Amino acid sequence: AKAHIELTINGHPVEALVEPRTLLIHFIREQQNLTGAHIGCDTSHCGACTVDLDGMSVKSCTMFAVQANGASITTIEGMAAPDGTLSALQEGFRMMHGLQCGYCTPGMIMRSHRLLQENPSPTEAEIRFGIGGNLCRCTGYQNIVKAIQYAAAKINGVP
Amino acid sequence: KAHIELTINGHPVEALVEPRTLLIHFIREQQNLTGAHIGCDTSHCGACTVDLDGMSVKSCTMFAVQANGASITTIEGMAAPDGTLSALQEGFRMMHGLQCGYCTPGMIMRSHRLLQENPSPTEAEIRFGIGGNLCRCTGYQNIVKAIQYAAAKINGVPFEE
Amino acid sequence: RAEKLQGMGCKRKRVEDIRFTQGKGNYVDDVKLPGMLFGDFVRSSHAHARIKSIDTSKAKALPGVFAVLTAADLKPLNLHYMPTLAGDVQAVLADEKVLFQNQEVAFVVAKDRYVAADAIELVEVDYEPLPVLVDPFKAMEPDAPLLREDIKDKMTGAHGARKHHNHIFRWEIGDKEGTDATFAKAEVVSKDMFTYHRVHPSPLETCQCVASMDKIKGELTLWGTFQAPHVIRTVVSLISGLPEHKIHVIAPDIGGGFGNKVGAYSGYVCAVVASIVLGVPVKWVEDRMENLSTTSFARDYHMTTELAATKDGKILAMRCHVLADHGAFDACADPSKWPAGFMNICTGSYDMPVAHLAVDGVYTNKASGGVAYRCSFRVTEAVYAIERAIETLAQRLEMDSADLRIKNFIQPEQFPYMAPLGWEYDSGNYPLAMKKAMDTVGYHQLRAEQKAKQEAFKRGETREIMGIGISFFTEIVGAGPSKNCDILGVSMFDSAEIRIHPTGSVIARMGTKSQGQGHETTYAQIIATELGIPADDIMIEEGNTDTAPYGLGTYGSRSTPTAGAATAVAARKIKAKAQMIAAHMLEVHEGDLEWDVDRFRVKGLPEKFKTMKELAWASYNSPPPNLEPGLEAVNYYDPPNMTYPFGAYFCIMDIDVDTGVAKTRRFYALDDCGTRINPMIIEGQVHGGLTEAFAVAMGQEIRYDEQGNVLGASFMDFFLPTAVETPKWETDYTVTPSPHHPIGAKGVGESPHVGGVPCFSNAVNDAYAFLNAGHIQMPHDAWRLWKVGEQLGLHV
Amino acid sequence: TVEPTSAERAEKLQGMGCKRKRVEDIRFTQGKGNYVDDVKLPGMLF
Amino acid sequence: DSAEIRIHPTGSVIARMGTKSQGQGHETTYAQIIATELGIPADDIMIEEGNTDTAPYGLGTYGSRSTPTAGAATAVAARKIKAKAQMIAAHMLEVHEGDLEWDVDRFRVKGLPEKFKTMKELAWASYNSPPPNLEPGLEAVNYYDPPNMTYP
Amino acid sequence: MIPGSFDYHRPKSIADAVALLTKLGEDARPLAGGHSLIPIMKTRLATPEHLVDLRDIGDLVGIREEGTDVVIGAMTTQHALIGSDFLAAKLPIIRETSLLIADPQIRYMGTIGGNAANGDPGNDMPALMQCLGAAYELTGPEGARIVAARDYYQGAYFTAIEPGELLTAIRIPVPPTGHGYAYEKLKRKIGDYATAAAAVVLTMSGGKCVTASIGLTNVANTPLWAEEAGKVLVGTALDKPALDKAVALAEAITAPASDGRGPAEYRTKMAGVMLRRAVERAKARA
Ligand SMILES: Cc1cc2nc3c(=O)[nH]c(=O)nc-3n(C[C@H](O)[C@H](O)[C@H](O)COP(=O)(O)OP(=O)(O)OC[C@H]3O[C@@H](n4cnc5c(N)ncnc54)[C@H](O)[C@@H]3O)c2cc1C
Ligand SMILES: Nc1ccn([C@@H]2O[C@H](COP(=O)(O)OP(=O)(O)OC[C@H]3Oc4nc5nc(N)nc(O)c5nc4C(S)=C3S)[C@@H](O)[C@H]2O)c(=O)n1
Ligand code: FES
Ligand code: FES
Ligand code: FES
Ligand code: FES
């Protein structure tokens, strides 16, 4: 008795049959083959699975795909512009060396995407608190803060 | 799309196909049984030969829908489950009956049927018996030997040299 | 041309980031192959028990389950144990008994990980409890339980006699008699037992693989989280019977390793066996709780550490004995001759006449490991031992511990310095770095501030205490010379192969394997400089054992020492051939040519030149008749010595004695790793390692209770700092090249952890030193620091 | 044997001059060649 | 044309060439060349062609050139490995290279046939106990510029 | 990581959800933000046969002032609590508390009702709601009833809710304008449940405390309302004598777990320290 869901992921319609117990992260990775999102834990701490879902940052390992029925999700694959151009965040993470192994990066960028909508001009304390749901093993966060600041400057220069 | 159910290499298959889908493309593109090959567009080469309800069929000259309910064997279906190659597969290797390998699935599938038709064929019967299968590499001589080898294997006794 | 080169020293932005920022990395769990199944383990609920029965019937009967392997399946293949790097064996699936909680008991292979998880729950294991051993200090008591029955009637293991069934090895080095003599007469003997508690590298990606036996071809492909994929290939060959040319190991992108991903785990072996049995691919991906509780732990050394000194603070000797808790199987990664790694760097940065080190390893009912988590083969422990001992000695001497260090540093002119436990340090300028550090942090001013704050505390004017942590450390990285460094008999070289294409771009591969350290960026910078070829015209690959030259992998901060060297050497082989081509083209002797960034010029006729680009083309287009066409080279680099980067780290820590909550005020990290290939990357490496050090010192732990339950092995409890907790890092450097390295570059990646933990722990210990707390064992989390203050009477 | 003669060792090489049977045949006789049109990639168009 | 041959620690081989079979049996026959040269059974040798990232640069298969060109390169590259193996053998056996003679798959000491190292042992040695003067491992490349055509 | 299988329901109203829960009985659980339940399903501590997702029930979301109360729908998320400037005006302690709960992602999903109904003494809202003297509005198959937060919690995962009930809203008396408030939490890191935390609201007049109420988080198998401790502040200047007495009375009722956050005796003391600090901050706000 799989459930039929319909939702939008990265601006595209998705329809699927899922077991209710399928975690959203697995739906995204395993069924949708959007393997940017990552699993880093089994307790909802790490944020590697973060996606932007109806204007929220969500840990997709702590949601069933059926809960995302009707949702609009952006994953990391959805961040670059249609012409390929990196988002400000993606660019900032590269420019500022905000990643190393890259494993937290999708979740970090997805969280940051929402952070900079919540607060386009965050202080460092606001950034750090604002990414508190996302663990990184490699970077010690310092360059991630820089990356987010860089991105904010780029964004804030666009208009 | 048309709904078909059939058996391929002993396994049930159920699929939806467009009517115009050639069997070769259903096998290759939808079933991912890419042993069978396409060598021509005029039904001469036999590279697409599969064994289908006890017949050798050029699967480029049949639509998948025509195979509804059929039992097909493709080259992937020839080796034993224990990994042991069929007599033909072995004979083709032993006798150097292939080079590029492109005709080989069709040659073996044809030959599988040939040897059921005629378990102990003469050379002339072999050559005629594979007339629907072109090979560019071998000049056929070793293919004949391969088939002879396979027949002798199957039969437990040699026939011609 | 200048803009494009992006060679050594440039803060070249990383090529990896393009894919990673877009989710187009290729990590193991991203792999999907036709027919691929998923396997995972039934794991032991018991720390120590006989397995009376495993009933797999209900699991096998579950739809979507394809296999349930138990030890009974593996035996026949001689795969119910697997060799370890330490020369022991580790149970793949438990046979007669389980020896640690969460140990692998059966491997269920199913259509997907959801079914596999369901089927795991259906396997029923009957246990007959045995007495659990978790306290290593009791491991060699006469009534200690016999853990390793499988090797019980073998009093000699892979590192000598075992004097007790739970004794793995005893290893000693240094001059015992001389050390003992010094301690017998020294004015001051400063002894403490420093425990470096068990922690775990916890890479954000857990361990995992996809095994695919192609039964038609008789070839195994194995994707996996392998820091040392060629080694894995060879091991898999030796234990499976498949020949190496038919084993294709692929380490793709790896989401951090931190040492966790060096060795083999049961998962890899079971996935392989399962794939061989089933002839379809089998994926195994562990969850975090199993990662933390069943893969390589780090640390777990109990270091009885003594310094002998004069009252004026000259260090005369060090005597250290370690009790090493290895868990149930000795799977402690190390070069084969070094069962306690390079713990014998524990005399540190100081010139001591004599020393002695003894290490006993014991079995306990715990996961295996030990060497992981930026340890550089027990250098974390060594450095902690010495840098804590420096502080406890300084306290006992009533001396400022910076002064004590300065009094004892190895001086720059002493290098290469033969230390008293056998390592010959390559280069170092410790006084300069220490001075730079102290000046930068205003050290003497800090001490005055601290004194004032202490007086304020005693007057009841503040509940905060200030500590100043110092860690001045000598690392030893780059394992290593073939004479003494081998991984199960393969000498610890590494390698590079560089091939220049006709149009002047390059493919280069190395025997290492990045897990985020930026090799794909930085190895190209080495080549770029050497050949004058823009870095972006160079493609770097690692990890595919079919294609990359054989190497020993990435760990022990060895990549730059070994493959970085090989890269430069191979590039220089190309350059030499290019010079010969240039000589041929320009109709001059090779000796008439000089290299000028990207071209050979004719001495005195600088207008007459051939560029590297032209030479690459000529090697294909007009190959000199004396020479082979093409332009490529390989080097397998057997290092002549380790590299010995160093650092001077200072932490100022404020601690609320009422809660135990410590807050880092400032952390300054000076690292000198010789020539710096990419300062941006180094800085990142440092940030990450300092954050680990903060975690280890201040919170992280894996524990076991008296029943052998593993405690805290999830992110509910395992302290991984977020951006909120993680201090800002202030980094600095000096540059003291390695003389023997082709580009003067030393490793660095582990340095920040190695140095950082003692820095933090020293800061905490230092904060409480005026209250006579003694050595406070890590971690320095709030409850523990509260207990310190409670026991000092601070709360009433 | 465990101590094969020179001739035995040479024979086992299946080296120069030998009518060594082809390694390619294993896959090709089983349809496990990989020819271009066997390639299928995500998103591939024709 | 070209060949690259790499011997693994346990004595099997990956070799690649700058040609590209279209059925001429190179994956079989190049290994035969190597097998004879090195005394490693052909079955222990994997031959690859055609992936430009991995195979050494060559000019392809046409003009019946593979045997003249890459076959030559294969032999020459294998002889480079043999020469290195001879050096390793001489080191291990503590004799001069001139004191060794090849017997199918091993170097024996002249006059003392009981003193020998097999190629397999030498391959392991090249990883396990590389003679101080030599790089570890056991591999070679040759790019072969033919002096003439062959005229069958 | 992998939950047991279950069936998933999306009732459209409270009545439907209650009917479902009542029908399916014990094997059904409400699903709110999922950020406690899904984690324990993933461990298979919980193996419900049915999840009844409250997502589609609009009336479970919102913040309103009704009479002398603020009424907050159970499905109002932490993020929404934080965002509410009206709540910040009336009950600023809530935003303060919420910002100490979990992390941004979890706060986007986790709801006040799920935090309150969960019965893990780790949750922060329970003791806050006890401090505030909130009432929980429950609707079940027998109709509506109200259970004081102070009466709601009996133990780990043991609460006053009865089979088939939903907690539909939390009704919180609005403290006087100018009241002091604080929620002071000690934790190992972002996201961690408290080692100890204290919620305080109090009012002052003439330099003397007129009212005080104290909740304690995660220092027993339930939240605690520290009734005696609050009482003893009343009439005092909230000076050291007064705070010592409150601390004593607060500590006395604790019975913390000994876990990774430290042993019970530490946590008892930390309840006291958090209390002190919360009273101090409340006093300064008042
Ligand atoms: C990593 C992490 C860190 C966290 N840290 C904290 C923290 O610091 N402090 C804190 O307070 N919380 C913390 N939480 C828990 C979080 O706040 C949860 O959101 C909260 O505990 C449950 O609310 P929910 O809406 O997610 O409920 P759910 O998880 O959906 O439900 C929890 C329970 O309450 C029941 N339930 C839910 N809604 C109702 C209702 N209306 N009526 C009846 N029963 C209902 C469910 O059936 C289940 O039994 C953390 C969670 C995670 C994953
Ligand atoms: N003199 C130097 C030294 C290093 N570098 C650069 O810094 C990086 C790290 O080089 P090196 O110090 O040689 O260390 P490795 O590459 O061998 O990395 C291993 C090391 O890497 C550490 N850092 C890690 N960082 C990430 N992101 N992921 C891991 O798994 C890590 N694991 C740890 C641990 S554990 C170890 S053992 C390389 O890009 C190198 O070019 C440099 O610019 N100049
Ligand atoms: S995988 Fe989702 S929070 Fe860790
Ligand atoms: S970049 Fe490796 S976990 Fe963040
Ligand atoms: S492809 Fe079918 S006969 Fe040629
Ligand atoms: S083997 Fe090449 S076409 Fe027959």
Nearest-CA distance from C784 to chain F in Å?
8
- Close Cβ partners of C57 (under 8 Å, ≥ 6 residues apart): none
Per the annotation, does C375 bind a ligand?
yes
Asked whether the beta carbons of A127 and C229 are under 8 A apart, the reply is no
CA distance E104 to E35: 10
Is the CB of A139 within 6 Å of ligand 4?
Answer: yes
Resolution in A: 1.1
Phi-psi sector, F172: left (phi>0), alpha (psi -120 to 50), beta: beta
- Nearest CA to F226 out of F198, F204, F207 is that of F198
Q: Which amino acid is at C306?
A: E
C6, C103, C208, C227: which one is catalytic? Answer: C227
CATH number of the domain bearing residue E18: 3.30.365.10
Q: Name the strand (E) or helix (H) holding C285.
A: strand C282-285
Angle at C46 (CA atoms; ends C43, C52), nearest 5 degrees: 85
DSSP string, C117-139: HHHHHH-EEEEEE------GGGT
Is the CB of F98 within 6 Å of ligand 1?
Answer: no
Contact B101 E23 (CB under 8 A): yes
- Nearest CA to E29 out of E63, E75, E60 is that of E75
Cis preceding linkage at E136, omega within 30? no
Question: Subunits touching E (CB < 8 Å, at least 3 pairs)?
Answer: B, C, D
Q: Do residues C26 and C107 share a domain?
A: yes
Out of F8, F34, F39, closest to residue A43 by CB: F39
Bridge partner list, A7: A14
C270, C375, C485, C651: which one is catalytic? Answer: C375
Tokens of F217: 């988080």
Q: Among this protein's residues, is C445 annotated catalytic?
A: no
Q: Do residues B84 and B70 share a domain?
A: no
C768 φ, ψ to 5°? -90, 0
Cis preceding linkage at C63, omega within 30? no
How far, CA to CA in Å, does B69 sit from each of B12, B62, B119, D40? 10, 14, 27, 27
Bridge partner list, F30: F52
Chain E positions in Cβ-Cβ contact with residue C238 (cut-off 8 Å): 10
CATH number of the domain bearing residue F20: 3.30.43.10
Strand C494-500: give its sheet, edge to edge.
C538-542, C506-510, C494-500, C631-637
Q: Do residues A54 and A95 share a domain?
A: no
Q: Do residues F257 and F228 share a domain?
A: yes
Q: Do residues B13 and B46 share a domain?
A: yes
**Any idea of the CA torsion for C18, C19, C22, C24, to the nearest 10 degrees?**
170
Tokens of C225: 């989280």
CATH number of the domain bearing residue F185: 3.30.390.50
CA distance A51 to A69: 14
Task: Count how many residues are written for chain D.
Answer: 46
Q: Do residues A86 and A145 share a domain?
A: yes
Tokens of C409: 């540093």
Domain end marker among B77, B111, B138: B77
CA distance F223 to F116: 10
Question: Is the minimum CB–CB distance between E102 and chain C shorter than 8 Å?
Answer: no
Write the burial class of residue C706 (CB in 10 Å: 0-12 exposed, 13-18 middle, 19+ buried): exposed
Q: Do residues F90 and F33 share a domain?
A: no
Tokens of C576: 């030499």
- For residue F154, the tally of other CB atoms under 10 A from its CB is 12
The residue whose CA is least distant from atom 1 of ligand 5 is B38
Q: Do residues A91 and A62 share a domain?
A: no
CA distance C542 to C553: 9
Nearest-CA distance from C670 to chain F in Å?
27
Q: Do residues A57 and A107 share a domain?
A: no
Cis preceding linkage at C779, omega within 30? yes
Q: Do residues B84 and B14 share a domain?
A: no
Q: Do residues B119 and B143 share a domain?
A: yes
Q: What is the CA radius of gyration of chain E?
A: 16
Q: Do residues F90 and F187 share a domain?
A: no
Domain end marker among C312, C345, C373: C373
Bridge partner list, C357: C173, C320
Q: Do residues B1 and B70 share a domain?
A: yes
| Contact of chains D and F by CB distance (3 or more pairs under 8 angstroms) | no
Q: Which amino acid is at C358?
A: A
C170, C374, C378, C599: which one is catalytic? Answer: C374
Domain range enclosing A62? 2-78
| Contact of chains C and A by CB distance (3 or more pairs under 8 angstroms) | yes
If you ran DSSP here, which 8-state letter would residue B41 be given?
S
Asked whether the beta carbons of E67 and E37 are under 8 A apart, the reply is no
Domain range enclosing F44? 1-54
Tokens of C395: 């306290």
> How many domains does chain E divide into?
1
Q: Do residues B66 and B28 share a domain?
A: yes
- Close Cβ partners of A117 (under 8 Å, ≥ 6 residues apart): A55
Q: Do residues C570 and C711 share a domain?
A: no
> How many domains does chain F divide into?
3
Nearest-CA distance from D26 to chain C in Å?
7
Q: Name the strand (E) or helix (H) holding B98.
A: none
Asked whether the beta carbons of E119 and E11 are under 8 A apart, the reply is yes
**3-state SS track over F82-96:** HHCHHHHHHCHHHHH
Strand F69-73: give its sheet, edge to edge.
F63-66, F69-73, F166-173, F135-140, F143-148
Q: Do residues B2 and B72 share a domain?
A: yes
**End-to-end Cα, chain E, rounded Å:** 19
Break chain C down into helix, strand, coil percent, rounded to 5. Answer: 30, 25, 40
Q: Do residues F229 and F273 share a domain?
A: yes
Bridge partner list, A85: none
Domain end marker among F127, F150, F174: F174
Rounded to 10°, the helix F240-253/F264-285 angle is 140
Out of D21, D28, D37, closest to residue B101 by CB: D28
Domain range enclosing C248? 200-296
F171 φ, ψ to 5°? -110, 115
Contact C723 A145 (CB under 8 A): yes
Chain-centre distance of CA C559, in angstroms? 11
Domain end marker among A21, A56, A78: A78
Asked whether the beta carbons of F99 and F192 are under 8 A apart, the reply is no
Domain end marker among C116, C131, C146: C131
Asked whether the beta carbons of A114 and A58 are under 8 A apart, the reply is no
CA distance C314 to C320: 18
Asked whether the beta carbons of C768 and C465 are under 8 A apart, the reply is yes
**Any idea of the CA torsion for C516, C519, C520, C522, to the nearest 10 degrees?**
130
Domain end marker among C616, C642, C668: C642
Query: Count of B–D CB contacts within 8 Å?
Result: 61
Q: Do residues F1 and F16 share a domain?
A: yes
Q: Do residues B83 and B70 share a domain?
A: no
Cα(B26) to centroid(ligand 5), Å: 14
**3-state SS track over B71-92:** EEECHHHCCCCCCCCCHHHHHH
Domain end marker among B51, B77, B103: B77
Question: Subunits touching B (CB < 8 Å, at least 3 pairs)?
Answer: C, D, E
Closest-CA residue of chain E to D21: E28
CA distance C313 to C391: 12
CATH number of the domain bearing residue B94: 1.10.150.120
Q: Which amino acid is at C245?
A: H
Cα(A47) to centroid(ligand 3), Å: 5
3-state secondary structure of C66: strand
Q: Which amino acid is at A42?
A: D
CA distance C615 to C610: 6
Is the CB of B103 within 6 Å of ligand 6?
Answer: yes
If you ran DSSP here, which 8-state letter would residue C446 be given?
H
CATH number of the domain bearing residue A73: 3.10.20.30
Q: Do residues C654 and C757 share a domain?
A: yes
- For residue A43, the tally of other CB atoms under 10 A from its CB is 21
> How many domains does chain B divide into?
2
C276 φ, ψ to 5°? -60, -45
Chain-centre distance of CA F224, in angstroms? 10
Q: Name the strand (E) or helix (H) holding D42.
A: none
Instruction: Name the structure determination technique.
Output: X-ray
Cα(C688) to centroid(ligand 4), Å: 9
C80 φ, ψ to 5°? -75, -15
- For residue F95, the tally of other CB atoms under 10 A from its CB is 18
Query: Count of B–E CB contacts within 8 Å?
Result: 9
